[PDB]
Structures are given as structure tokens and as C-alpha cells.
Amino acid sequence: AQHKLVFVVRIKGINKIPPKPRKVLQLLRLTRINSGTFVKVTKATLELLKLIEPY
């Protein structure tokens, strides 16, 4: 079975982030370096993770 849950850690600090990924990061509650959250995987959340991949 494809995985149902990801854990996400923010790995970059809070300076020089473009607007779109900056909003997505705020929507996943990742507003600080090394903060992490669980995310239920779906097409709706996978496309968010694409946007914030470098961070």
C-alpha cells in the first residue's frame, strides 16, 4: 500500500522564502527551523509538499 502519513520537518530558516512556499509552510504550521508536523497524504497534500520541497 502507498504510504498514508508523512512527517515533515522544516530544514531552512525564515529569510528569503518566496511568497507561495512561504504561505504553504504557514498552512502546515512550520514557522521555524526544525519544527515538524504530520500530514495525511492525498493528492491535495502531495501538491503542497511539491511546492515546499527545497525547504
Partner: peptide, 9 residues
């Protein structure tokens, strides 16, 4: 409605 889901086994 639900978003497209992870494939089952």
C-alpha cells in the same frame, strides 16, 4: 467529496 487517495496494496 474526497481528494484522490493513496493506492491500496
Amino acid at each position: 467529496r474526497q481528494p484522490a487517495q493513496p493506492r491500496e496494496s
